[PDB]
Design a protein around this nucleic acid. Structure first.
Ligand code: PRO
Ligand SMILES: [Mg+2]
Ligand SMILES: [Mg+2]
Ligand SMILES: [Mg+2]
Ligand SMILES: [Mg+2]
Ligand SMILES: [Mg+2]
Ligand SMILES: [Mg+2]
Ligand SMILES: [Mg+2]
Ligand SMILES: [Mg+2]
Ligand SMILES: [Mg+2]
Ligand SMILES: [Mg+2]
Ligand SMILES: [Mg+2]
Ligand SMILES: [Mg+2]
Ligand SMILES: [Mg+2]
Ligand SMILES: [Mg+2]
Ligand SMILES: [Mg+2]
Ligand SMILES: [Mg+2]
Ligand SMILES: [Mg+2]
Ligand SMILES: [Mg+2]
Ligand SMILES: [Mg+2]
Ligand SMILES: [Mg+2]
Ligand SMILES: [Mg+2]
Ligand SMILES: [Mg+2]
Ligand SMILES: [Mg+2]
Ligand SMILES: [Mg+2]
Ligand SMILES: [Mg+2]
Ligand SMILES: [Mg+2]
Ligand SMILES: [Mg+2]
Ligand SMILES: [Mg+2]
Ligand SMILES: [Mg+2]
Ligand SMILES: [Mg+2]
Ligand SMILES: [Mg+2]
Ligand SMILES: [Mg+2]
Ligand SMILES: [Mg+2]
Ligand SMILES: [Mg+2]
Ligand SMILES: [Mg+2]
Ligand SMILES: [Mg+2]
Ligand SMILES: [Mg+2]
Ligand SMILES: [Mg+2]
Ligand SMILES: [Mg+2]
Ligand SMILES: [Mg+2]
Ligand SMILES: [Mg+2]
Ligand SMILES: [Mg+2]
Ligand SMILES: [Mg+2]
Ligand SMILES: [Mg+2]
Ligand SMILES: [Mg+2]
Ligand SMILES: [Mg+2]
Ligand SMILES: [Mg+2]
Ligand SMILES: [Mg+2]
Ligand SMILES: [Mg+2]
Ligand SMILES: [Mg+2]
Ligand SMILES: [Mg+2]
Ligand SMILES: [Mg+2]
Ligand SMILES: [Mg+2]
Ligand SMILES: [Mg+2]
Ligand SMILES: [Mg+2]
Ligand SMILES: [Mg+2]
Ligand SMILES: [Mg+2]
Ligand SMILES: [Mg+2]
Ligand SMILES: [Mg+2]
Ligand SMILES: [Mg+2]
Ligand SMILES: [Mg+2]
Ligand SMILES: [Mg+2]
Ligand SMILES: [Mg+2]
Ligand SMILES: [Mg+2]
Ligand SMILES: [Mg+2]
Ligand SMILES: [Mg+2]
Ligand SMILES: [Mg+2]
Ligand SMILES: [Mg+2]
Ligand SMILES: [Mg+2]
Ligand SMILES: [Mg+2]
Ligand SMILES: [Mg+2]
Ligand SMILES: [Mg+2]
Ligand SMILES: [Mg+2]
Ligand SMILES: [Mg+2]
Ligand SMILES: [Mg+2]
Ligand SMILES: [Mg+2]
Ligand SMILES: [Mg+2]
Ligand SMILES: [Mg+2]
Ligand SMILES: [Mg+2]
Ligand SMILES: [Mg+2]
Ligand SMILES: [Mg+2]
Ligand SMILES: [Mg+2]
Ligand SMILES: [Mg+2]
Ligand SMILES: [Mg+2]
Ligand SMILES: [Mg+2]
Ligand SMILES: [Mg+2]
Ligand SMILES: [Mg+2]
Ligand SMILES: [Mg+2]
Ligand SMILES: [Mg+2]
Ligand SMILES: [Mg+2]
Ligand SMILES: [Mg+2]
Ligand SMILES: [Mg+2]
Ligand SMILES: [Mg+2]
Ligand SMILES: [Mg+2]
Ligand SMILES: [Mg+2]
Ligand SMILES: [Mg+2]
Ligand SMILES: [Mg+2]
Ligand SMILES: [Mg+2]
Ligand SMILES: [Mg+2]
Ligand SMILES: [Mg+2]
Ligand SMILES: [Mg+2]
Ligand SMILES: [Mg+2]
Ligand SMILES: [Mg+2]
Ligand SMILES: [Mg+2]
Ligand SMILES: [Mg+2]
Ligand SMILES: [Mg+2]
Ligand SMILES: [Mg+2]
Ligand SMILES: [Mg+2]
Ligand SMILES: [Mg+2]
Ligand SMILES: [Mg+2]
Ligand SMILES: [Mg+2]
Ligand SMILES: [Mg+2]
Ligand SMILES: [Mg+2]
Ligand SMILES: [Mg+2]
Ligand SMILES: [Mg+2]
Ligand SMILES: [Mg+2]
Ligand SMILES: [Mg+2]
Ligand SMILES: [Mg+2]
Ligand SMILES: [Mg+2]
Ligand SMILES: [Mg+2]
Ligand SMILES: [Mg+2]
Ligand SMILES: [Mg+2]
Ligand SMILES: [Mg+2]
Ligand SMILES: [Mg+2]
Ligand SMILES: [Mg+2]
Ligand SMILES: [Mg+2]
Ligand SMILES: [Mg+2]
Ligand SMILES: [Mg+2]
Ligand SMILES: [Mg+2]
Ligand SMILES: [Mg+2]
Ligand SMILES: [Mg+2]
Ligand SMILES: [Mg+2]
Ligand SMILES: [Mg+2]
Ligand SMILES: [Mg+2]
Ligand SMILES: [Mg+2]
Ligand SMILES: [Mg+2]
Ligand SMILES: [Mg+2]
Ligand SMILES: [Mg+2]
Ligand SMILES: [Mg+2]
Ligand SMILES: [Mg+2]
Ligand SMILES: [Mg+2]
Ligand SMILES: [Mg+2]
Ligand SMILES: [Mg+2]
Ligand SMILES: [Mg+2]
Ligand SMILES: [Mg+2]
Ligand SMILES: [Mg+2]
Ligand SMILES: [Mg+2]
Ligand SMILES: [Mg+2]
Ligand SMILES: [Mg+2]
Ligand SMILES: [Mg+2]
Ligand SMILES: [Mg+2]
Ligand SMILES: [Mg+2]
Ligand SMILES: [Mg+2]
Ligand SMILES: [Mg+2]
Ligand SMILES: [Mg+2]
Ligand SMILES: [Mg+2]
Ligand SMILES: [Mg+2]
Ligand SMILES: [Mg+2]
Ligand SMILES: [Mg+2]
Ligand SMILES: [Mg+2]
Lengths: 55, 58, 185, 159, 172, 56
RNA sequence: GGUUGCGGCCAUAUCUACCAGAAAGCACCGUUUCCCGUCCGAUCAACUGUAGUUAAGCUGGUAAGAGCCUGACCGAGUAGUGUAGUGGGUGACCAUACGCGAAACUCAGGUGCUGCAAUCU
RNA sequence: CAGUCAAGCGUUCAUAGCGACAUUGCUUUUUGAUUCUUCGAUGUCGGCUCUUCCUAUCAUACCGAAGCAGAAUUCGGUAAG
RNA sequence: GAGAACAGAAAUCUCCAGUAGAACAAAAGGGUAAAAGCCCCCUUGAUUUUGAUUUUCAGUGUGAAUACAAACCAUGAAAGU
RNA sequence: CCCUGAAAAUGGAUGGCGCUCAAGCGUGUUACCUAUACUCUACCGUCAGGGUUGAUAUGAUGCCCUGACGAGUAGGCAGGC
RNA sequence: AAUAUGUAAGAAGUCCUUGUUACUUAAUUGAACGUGGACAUUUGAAUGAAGAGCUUUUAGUGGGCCAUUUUUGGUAAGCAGAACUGGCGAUGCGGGAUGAACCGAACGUAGAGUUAAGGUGCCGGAAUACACGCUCAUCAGACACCACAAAAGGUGUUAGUU
RNA sequence: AAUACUGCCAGCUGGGACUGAGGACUGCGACGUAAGUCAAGGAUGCUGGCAUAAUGGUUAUAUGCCGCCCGUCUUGAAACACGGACCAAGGAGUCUAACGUCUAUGCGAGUGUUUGGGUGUAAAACCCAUACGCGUAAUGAAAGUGAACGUAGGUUGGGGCC
RNA sequence: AAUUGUUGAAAGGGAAGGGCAUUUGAUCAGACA
């Protein structure tokens, strides 16, 4: 909710430590934007499926 | 026997080891090179308000 | 691998036990490492460290410096602690009462401290008397009265005393020291 | 050989702005400076005396000495991997009051108000600046405003 | 660029004090997911209006599902693309069953025949051709002649083991 | 809708050959190794940060 | 509101052609004993405020005026540019991705604001 | 050493054979430029000898073209047997 | 530019326009119009004592420079310089 | 896209074999292979944070919990043989 | 303009009262340093902080080379010289057959898993997988850096334009 | 109405692989009316095989994949750069005078017995008077002069203590 | 020790030697109880 204490609530959490995505990446080359068929920058609603494969 | 002439490759790399110290700030800085006439009086005027505060714990 | 942000495998850089090898010194450390782990009282952590300190960081507290410290307002009954030797000083003619805890007292110093109707306490008797260090006055000697610091930071316009082995004129007092022989510092 | 003198490279740096030459206008000598004022250094092409070095052009610093015709500004000069302190003896035509601090002051005098006017009301204040927050939820209406479909357009030449 | 969906997109020049309710423009983008679709929307709006994403906002992004997906249609298609020597408009005709399934083969055809990748095409217009004989292009008109039939000769069978003991037919 | 107010970032690109500026922001977001990942509150004064490091 | 002495910002105050300016003020204007300076009382100095004038200075208005000033989704999200790719291309060069973004151009509106002090139908 | 445009040369006729101004290439037996390799050493012109390879073919084989009547020549193809 | 005997492309005299299109030892770049330019008048501050400061920098030196302090002077009605 | 333009010296190189509705070119969709990287665990060493003199057994530079990190020439230091 | 760059975002702060002097004002005027007094962590942006500050003494180094971008001389150069960053040097590992510098990823000893760059006919682990086209070369073609080709042509075929 | 697609469930459930660190108890829980029970701060139960070269170690060989000569100087060496046929044994940052930082020890406004004398179980240990050396005063070319206005000052941070 | 003779075992299609791993041959420790 990004509530009043999100700074200390957030920084309390030690930076997360994911695996390489399980399915793979779905792009062929990663270091392009998402919009250009690569993997970086804001992909929005989809940052999830990615994360739930790296977890 | 000509040799490289000059460069600056690898000198911000070195600058940012021990990394460009911030300039260091002091309450009550030096009066160095302040108006000699201002100081003459100020010394006398500091000597005055001093006196006025030992006379204040009499 | 990791973008390291801080030099890895860093040593803390504070002594962790005296470098000296004196049995008695190391016992004192055991007294105070204990005292300091189990007493939540400041004075025990300060003393513990200072016992690790090298001779250079243990300048002598003189007996007159001690005398003066008592003249602080409301300080005249506190018991002064000097983690290191304490030296005599014929320059005060008088000297007060109190009780000085110290690593060492010189011949001259305990004389004057006792002669004044006083007491000389080794560091472990002070423990017993003041486990929380209640009512102590810790003094340090002056660390930069050392000769060597004169020559530190030498360089032009630092006015900082040559490393020189004879002195006098003929000994680094011409060119680059005066307006009329080249220049000045 | 190469050249490297006190004013080198300052061609346009010390030039005069356009149709703004001639004597300088008298408010420049009216402004009053006391120790601790923040000043913005900018050399004046027309006053050759007491002129800042080209380096300190566009550099701000604080006046440490006030004298008949001149201020004394100190400026922090990062040389090497450090900063040194340089004192600069500028003339008044070349210095000026930095508005950099205005927004502060106009906000501290204002941070007094909101504080008193709210304490004397019943606490709750909040007077820390916050970055631009994203936009909230909204209903953009369609009445008198049907969407206008656009397309890409073919390739013309016109020449 | 992928498997395509059609999206209407709608944006408008972020409101101001003296211009609340700015004007709203729609496009129909042909893209694969909604994140690309909005990218394209801004790509093209800044080719017509004084906007950018920085100063506007998308009002609605809505998928458009083909109206009759089991009605074969004849699609005319209008395109602008960049070649290695300049840029040029085109028109092609695609026979398929949904505006989107056509945009797919378009980008394939453009790629195979004119070496043009996604980045260089602009889909000017896609349109269902109502009456026949407005079908201009031949590679389509072939398939609109009455009671049409045709064999599929020299038929070739996907062998599922490495060795075979027959000797194939291509019969059909 | 309201613009999103919170973002989650995971570092994609490895450790080496990274230019000084974004190499700094990656640290201030605690993303100092590949495939680790933090939350970031979405405000201009971080949205620029987010911008500064998309390639990674 | 005018004017004047002193101003601030220093063309929305400037440039070109006309026109209008009550009152007071400014001006031009009269004299050459005296201080004063000129090849020349034109400028500079003195005396008169008398003997004359709104001609000019000066103030304001006119103009599809020049100039200058302001603005706009005018051009133009263009030109340039920070970042990205094992993008395209023989190259020259060029698309696209996340951002920042001119100058000209074209249309509109404007044509000194104002401080201290004295004075004026 | 080879091209492209083709204004011109060629009685006439641009291109049989040539070709200006321009412009595009190639080659590495020219010569430069460079100083990467060798200065505790790669023996340094020419010839003699003798082998092999390249083809941008001088001859020989079979061809197309000609401003080829014949004879002679010329431009060109396949070609280093 | 428009005007005046010899006098002419150029001698000297006058009026108008004139943002600097001139001049300021010198190379060039800044800068300057009741001036910084030109003509005049009075001058020696191109002086005495010793520190701070900027550029070059090692924040040594040398060169050059800035702004004060303390004298003695120049100019001008004066502020000033 | 293909062809012509397109000429060098031992015999030879899309890495090789070979491939032609490709095993070629453009583009799309999935599945799959495997770094000293990533995730989890174990062990070593380093650094750090804590706990523990209470006797009546054996290490207090010791014992116990905990977290993070580990490339390396010249070069420093350390602890060992 | 972009990119780059100076300062600022408070307790060393802010507000009232009225003390010192030989500077300075016409002037207790101002300047400068102060005594007394009023207001605390939403005390004045964000993110980070395996803390911050400080001193002394000493090694090696002071032949450099490459890559993208900017960039000077040169027809050019695997040429010579600058700028920013990243590298190689000093660094192995995976990909690029091969290779100092490219791509990926930086190394304690191991296990299981997932991947990067790059690949999956056979050599060779991995679809002789899927789908639309295009190409037939009596010197086809086949993956960045990279191991080169141009003007000009074609009634080969392909799809487009007026 | 259905379905697809995208998303969620602190809904059920099968197969397969790797691990099993720890070693009384102690924590947070979970199920039970309850007694007790549990998958809740790290593997136990049951059954069999051999008790040996079975497992394991060493070694030779073979087979898959990988592996250039080391040393040096160099931007760059496996280099078509140098030394090196092979073995043993020698073989290179010392000692001294005078010094800087640092540390340990002694004593401390002083400190240094060892030129010397005394003395001895005789190059040892033990002892010691007079000087000297460095330090406890500085600063000037020198003649020379020579460190308390004051609780050895005022201000601002300061650990610690009260 | 280099280097050599004999004997024994073993490998050897333009060097030899090395890494990880396992077959086979030879040899060996410990551990059951
Ligand atoms: O060869 C030749 C050279 C020329 C000088 C001597 N040697
Ligand atoms: Mg898998
Ligand atoms: Mg799956
Ligand atoms: Mg994948
Ligand atoms: Mg790939
Ligand atoms: Mg997982
Ligand atoms: Mg040389
Ligand atoms: Mg060179
Ligand atoms: Mg050099
Ligand atoms: Mg110490
Ligand atoms: Mg001390
Ligand atoms: Mg001393
Ligand atoms: Mg020293
Ligand atoms: Mg001396
Ligand atoms: Mg000097
Ligand atoms: Mg020059
Ligand atoms: Mg210049
Ligand atoms: Mg002017
Ligand atoms: Mg001057
Ligand atoms: Mg797009
Ligand atoms: Mg655009
Ligand atoms: Mg386009
Ligand atoms: Mg199949
Ligand atoms: Mg964050
Ligand atoms: Mg932020
Ligand atoms: Mg963005
Ligand atoms: Mg009148
Ligand atoms: Mg007059
Ligand atoms: Mg008038
Ligand atoms: Mg009139
Ligand atoms: Mg007037
Ligand atoms: Mg006008
Ligand atoms: Mg463009
Ligand atoms: Mg750009
Ligand atoms: Mg890259
Ligand atoms: Mg590129
Ligand atoms: Mg070109
Ligand atoms: Mg753009
Ligand atoms: Mg226009
Ligand atoms: Mg030619
Ligand atoms: Mg021609
Ligand atoms: Mg003919
Ligand atoms: Mg003909
Ligand atoms: Mg002819
Ligand atoms: Mg021709
Ligand atoms: Mg060539
Ligand atoms: Mg060549
Ligand atoms: Mg030749
Ligand atoms: Mg050489
Ligand atoms: Mg040579
Ligand atoms: Mg040799
Ligand atoms: Mg030889
Ligand atoms: Mg030779
Ligand atoms: Mg030879
Ligand atoms: Mg020889
Ligand atoms: Mg003929
Ligand atoms: Mg004939
Ligand atoms: Mg004949
Ligand atoms: Mg032929
Ligand atoms: Mg032959
Ligand atoms: Mg042959
Ligand atoms: Mg005349
Ligand atoms: Mg000269
Ligand atoms: Mg000049
Ligand atoms: Mg004037
Ligand atoms: Mg003259
Ligand atoms: Mg002189
Ligand atoms: Mg210097
Ligand atoms: Mg220095
Ligand atoms: Mg220096
Ligand atoms: Mg320096
Ligand atoms: Mg010197
Ligand atoms: Mg100068
Ligand atoms: Mg093709
Ligand atoms: Mg060969
Ligand atoms: Mg080839
Ligand atoms: Mg292949
Ligand atoms: Mg193939
Ligand atoms: Mg393909
Ligand atoms: Mg799938
Ligand atoms: Mg498959
Ligand atoms: Mg690896
Ligand atoms: Mg590992
Ligand atoms: Mg401990
Ligand atoms: Mg290491
Ligand atoms: Mg060891
Ligand atoms: Mg030993
Ligand atoms: Mg711009
Ligand atoms: Mg900044
Ligand atoms: Mg008084
Ligand atoms: Mg107070
Ligand atoms: Mg902050
Ligand atoms: Mg934090
Ligand atoms: Mg910390
Ligand atoms: Mg050093
Ligand atoms: Mg050094
Ligand atoms: Mg040198
Ligand atoms: Mg050196
Ligand atoms: Mg050297
Ligand atoms: Mg460039
Ligand atoms: Mg070069
Ligand atoms: Mg790089
Ligand atoms: Mg490096
Ligand atoms: Mg080297
Ligand atoms: Mg390196
Ligand atoms: Mg590397
Ligand atoms: Mg490899
Ligand atoms: Mg690769
Ligand atoms: Mg990549
Ligand atoms: Mg093979
Ligand atoms: Mg296989
Ligand atoms: Mg061929
Ligand atoms: Mg050919
Ligand atoms: Mg050939
Ligand atoms: Mg072939
Ligand atoms: Mg390419
Ligand atoms: Mg290759
Ligand atoms: Mg051409
Ligand atoms: Mg062509
Ligand atoms: Mg064609
Ligand atoms: Mg066209
Ligand atoms: Mg579902
Ligand atoms: Mg579920
Ligand atoms: Mg167990
Ligand atoms: Mg266990
Ligand atoms: Mg219950
Ligand atoms: Mg249980
Ligand atoms: Mg056995
Ligand atoms: Mg066995
Ligand atoms: Mg056995
Ligand atoms: Mg067994
Ligand atoms: Mg057995
Ligand atoms: Mg054997
Ligand atoms: Mg072996
Ligand atoms: Mg190999
Ligand atoms: Mg070797
Ligand atoms: Mg070399
Ligand atoms: Mg090399
Ligand atoms: Mg080597
Ligand atoms: Mg070689
Ligand atoms: Mg040599
Ligand atoms: Mg040799
Ligand atoms: Mg030996
Ligand atoms: Mg030796
Ligand atoms: Mg040392
Ligand atoms: Mg000691
Ligand atoms: Mg003494
Ligand atoms: Mg002795
Ligand atoms: Mg004897
Ligand atoms: Mg005796
Ligand atoms: Mg004696
Ligand atoms: Mg003595
Ligand atoms: Mg001394
Ligand atoms: Mg003295
Ligand atoms: Mg003297
Ligand atoms: Mg005397
Ligand atoms: Mg006195
Ligand atoms: Mg006195
Ligand atoms: Mg004070
Ligand atoms: Mg052989
Ligand atoms: Mg047993």
């Amino acid at each position: 909710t990004v509530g009043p204490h999100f700074k200390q609530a957030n920084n309390f959490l030690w930076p997360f430590k994911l695996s390489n995505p399980s399915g793979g990446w779905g792009v062929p080359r990663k270091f392009k934007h998402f919009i250009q068929g690569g993997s970086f920058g804001n992909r929005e609603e989809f940052i999830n499926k990615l994360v739930k494969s790296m977890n | 026997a000509k040799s490289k002439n000059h460069t600056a490759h690898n000198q911000t790399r070195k600058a940012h080891r021990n990394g460009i110290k911030k300039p260091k700030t002091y309450k009550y800085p030096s009066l160095k090179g302040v108006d000699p006439k201002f100081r003459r009086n100020h010394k006398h005027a500091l000597h005055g308000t001093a006196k006025a505060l030992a006379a204040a714990k009499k | 691998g990791i973008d390291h942000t801080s030099k890895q495998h860093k040593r803390s850089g504070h002594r962790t036990a005296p470098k000296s090898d004196n049995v008695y010194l190391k016992l004192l450390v055991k007294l105070y490492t204990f005292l300091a782990r189990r007493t939540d009282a400041p004075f025990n952590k300060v003393v513990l460290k200072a016992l690790f300190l090298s001779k250079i960081n243990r300048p002598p507290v003189s007996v007159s410096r001690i005398a003066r410290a008592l003249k602080q307002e409301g300080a005249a009954n506190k018991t002064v602690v000097v983690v290191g030797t304490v030296t005599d000083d014929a320059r005060i003619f008088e000297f007060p009462k109190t009780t000085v805890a110290a690593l060492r007292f010189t011949a001259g110093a305990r004389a004057k401290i006792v002669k004044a109707g006083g007491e000389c306490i080794t560091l472990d008797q002070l423990a017993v008397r003041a486990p929380k260090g209640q009512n102590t006055l810790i003094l340090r000697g002056p660390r930069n009265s050392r000769e060597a610091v004169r020559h530190f930071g030498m360089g032009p316009h630092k006015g900082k005393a040559p490393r020189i082995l004879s002195t006098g004129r003929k000994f680094e007092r011409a060119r680059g020291r005066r307006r009329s022989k080249g220049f000045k510092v | 050989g190469k050249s490297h003198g006190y004013r080198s490279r300052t061609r346009y740096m010390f030039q005069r702005d356009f149709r703004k030459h001639g004597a300088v206008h008298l408010s420049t000598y009216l402004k009053v400076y006391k120790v601790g004022d923040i000043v913005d250094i900018k050399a004046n092409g027309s006053i050759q005396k007491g002129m800042p070095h080209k380096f300190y052009q566009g550099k701000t610093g604080v006046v440490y000495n006030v004298t008949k015709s001149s201020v004394g500004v100190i400026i922090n000069k990062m040389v090497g991997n450090r900063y040194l302190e340089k004192r600069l003896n500028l003339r008044v035509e070349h210095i000026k009051h930095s508005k950099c601090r205005q927004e502060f002051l106009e906000r501290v005098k204002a941070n007094a108000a909101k504080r008193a006017e709210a304490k004397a009301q019943g606490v709750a204040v909040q007077l820390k600046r916050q970055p631009a927050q994203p936009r909230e939820s909204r209903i953009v209406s369609t009445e008198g405003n049907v969407p206008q479909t656009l397309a890409p357009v073919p390739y013309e030449t016109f020449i | 660029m992928a498997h395509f969906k059609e999206y209407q997109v709608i944006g408008r020049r972020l409101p101001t004090e003296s211009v609340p309710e700015p004007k709203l423009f729609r496009m129909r983008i042909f893209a694969s997911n909604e994140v690309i679709a909005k990218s394209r929307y801004w790509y093209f709006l800044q080719k017509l209006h004084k906007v950018k994403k920085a100063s506007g906002e998308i009002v609605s992004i809505n998928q458009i599902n083909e109206a009759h997906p089991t009605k074969v249609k004849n699609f005319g298609v209008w395109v602008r693309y960049d070649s290695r020597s300049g840029t040029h408009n085109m028109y092609k005709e695609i026979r398929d069953v949904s505006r989107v399934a056509a945009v797919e083969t378009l980008y394939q055809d453009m790629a195979a025949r004119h070496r043009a990748r996604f980045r260089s095409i602009h889909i000017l217009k896609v349109a269902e051709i109502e009456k026949t004989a407005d079908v201009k292009r031949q590679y389509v008109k072939q398939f609109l002649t009455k009671d049409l039939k045709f064999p599929l000769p020299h038929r070739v069978q996907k062998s599922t083991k490495t060795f075979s003991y027959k000797r194939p037919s291509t019969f059909y | 809708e309201a613009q999103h107010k919170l973002v989650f970032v995971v570092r994609i690109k490895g450790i080496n050959k990274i230019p000084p500026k974004p190499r700094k922001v990656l640290q201030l977001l605690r993303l100092t190794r590949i495939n680790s990942g933090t939350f970031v509150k979405v405000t201009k004064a971080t949205l620029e940060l987010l911008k500064l490091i998309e390639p990674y």
